[PDB]
Amino acid sequence: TAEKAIEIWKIRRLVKQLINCHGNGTSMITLIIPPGEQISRYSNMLAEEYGTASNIKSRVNRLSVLSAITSTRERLKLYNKVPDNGLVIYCGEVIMEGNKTRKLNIDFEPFKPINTSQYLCDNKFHTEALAELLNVKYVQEKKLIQRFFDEISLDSGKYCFGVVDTMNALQEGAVETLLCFADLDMIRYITYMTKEQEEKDSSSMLLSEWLAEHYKDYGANLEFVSDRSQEGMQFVKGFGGIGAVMRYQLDLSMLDPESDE
Amino acid sequence: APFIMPIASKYKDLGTILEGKIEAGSIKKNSNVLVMPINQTLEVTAIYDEADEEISSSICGDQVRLRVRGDDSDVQTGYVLTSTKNPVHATTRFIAQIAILELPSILTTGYSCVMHIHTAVEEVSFAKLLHKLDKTNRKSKKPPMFATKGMKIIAELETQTPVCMERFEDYQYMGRFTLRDQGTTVAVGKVVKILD
């Protein structure tokens, strides 16, 4: 539940971007290999699909499927055993802004995709499979945000609430629990910003993602919350979607008014 | 004095029947009413009082059933029949005094819930808390970080879709509303300014 849900978080981010992107002409390889299997079986299966795929008559499409099956196969070959229970591969080139595509090939070991074997070559990625790696979840979420609200109903002075403030509190000394909004719209170039970048004339990660990888080096304790609950929506639209319950009052310095200059 | 009748019920039956209680103004047989907020125009071709008898016209305070003519596929219970000269106001943003009642934790900007203004019922969320109030209803000059049980406060509220309403100062009924975290009634309040 602890650092487990933190992973489910990332899976949810992935599935979200896969079904988001679309390619033309059935050329998107999705491949899921359950544990206990041998790689060689699927390897020289794609090999067959390669022969089969060679009857298409759609030069532009055929050629596409060929290079996708190939791109998968010799990626799959890189593994020597279906790693401790699970292997997932999404592959193919997907349309992009500016009209220039970008061949995409993800492969990763999940957390026991029990019995779920699957090959598919559609014009989109099939994430239904992944769905198994995903209100007990909401009650904890609501319970957590309320724990945070108490620090406001009590004025205690343990909490923040704010990007520049929560980051500083984390940066400085300690925060007990970091509350972050799943779909937080924040990029970490250190100066933080949202999608207010088309106007400004300002390594380059998503704050959301950077926290998921470094929070450990700070004491917390990180929880991703969704704006499903009433609490969530509050926590998001009312408190920037990012905050923390500290232990112990700080003075939030660096920096702005007080000034004075 | 504009006509105002919040549609409480709507049903078909060889003709549409909108029924409500006239809250202001009057309506005559063969007149044109406006359905707010959708700005649909309808013709009124009959008025029937509680005795099920037709009448030539109803003043306000009357409980009537109206038989209307015209496209109404969009007319829903909660909308308001009004005159095409001074149609009742409708908006998605408004400011309002709010007495917080049973509200089991806190209340801050992101707070969303169900608002029942008149015949209507609608999803509402707080936009901003503007002031707090004490005993002699005073205007705290710092906006409240949050709100709590039994606390007077004045905030800004947003709705997904337009709802007809009026300043409590102008039409008490069109201005009162209660709020429900629809477990229970968390607050009551009155509209103090329609934001366009």
Swiss-Prot record, chain A:
SMART domains: eRF1_1. Keywords: Cytoplasm, Methylation, Phosphoprotein, Protein biosynthesis. Changing F239A: Reduced interaction with sup35/eRF3. Changing F149A: Reduced interaction with sup35/eRF3. The modification Phosphoserine is found at S259. Changing F161A: Does not affect interaction with sup35/eRF3. Its main location: cytoplasm. One of its GO terms (cellular component) is cytosol. Signal peptide: none annotated. It comes from the Eukaryota. InterPro entries: eFR1_2_sf, eRF1_1_Pelota, eRF1_1_sf, eRF1_2, eRF1_3, Peptide_chain-rel_eRF1/aRF1, Ribosomal_eL30-like_sf. GO terms for biological process: cytoplasmic translational termination. It is found in: Cytoplasm. The keyword Cell division does not apply. GO terms for molecular function: GTPase regulator activity; sequence-specific mRNA binding; translation release factor activity, codon specific. Changing Y159A: Slightly reduced interaction with sup35/eRF3. Component of the eRF1-eRF3-GTP ternary complex, a ternary complex that mediates translation termination in response to the termination codons. The eRF1-eRF3-GTP complex binds to a stop codon in the ribosomal A-site. Sup45/eRF1 is responsible for stop codon recognition and inducing hydrolysis of peptidyl-tRNA. Following GTP hydrolysis by sup35/eRF3, sup35/eRF3 dissociates, permitting sup45/eRF1 to accommodate fully in the A-site. Component of the eRF1-eRF3-GTP ternary complex, composed of sup45/eRF1, sup35/eRF3 and GTP. Belongs to the eukaryotic release factor 1 family. This is Eukaryotic peptide chain release factor subunit 1. The gene is sup45.
Curated annotation (Swiss-Prot), chain B:
Changing S105A: Reduced interaction with sup45/eRF1. Disulfide bonds: none annotated. It is found in: Cytoplasm. The modification Phosphoserine is found at S73. Changing D181A: Reduced interaction with sup45/eRF1. GTPase component of the eRF1-eRF3-GTP ternary complex, a ternary complex that mediates translation termination in response to the termination codons. Sup35/eRF3 mediates sup45/ERF1 delivery to stop codons: The eRF1-eRF3-GTP complex binds to a stop codon in the ribosomal A-site. GTP hydrolysis by sup35/eRF3 induces a conformational change that leads to its dissociation, permitting sup45/eRF1 to accommodate fully in the A-site. Component of the eRF1-eRF3-GTP ternary complex, composed of sup45/eRF1, sup35/eRF3 and GTP. Belongs to the TRAFAC class translation factor GTPase superfamily. Classic translation factor GTPase family. ERF3 subfamily. This is Eukaryotic peptide chain release factor GTP-binding subunit. It comes from Schizosaccharomyces pombe (strain 972 / ATCC 24843) (Fission yeast). The lineage of its organism: Eukaryota, Fungi, Dikarya, Ascomycota, Taphrinomycotina. The chain holds residues 467 to 662 of 662 of the full protein.
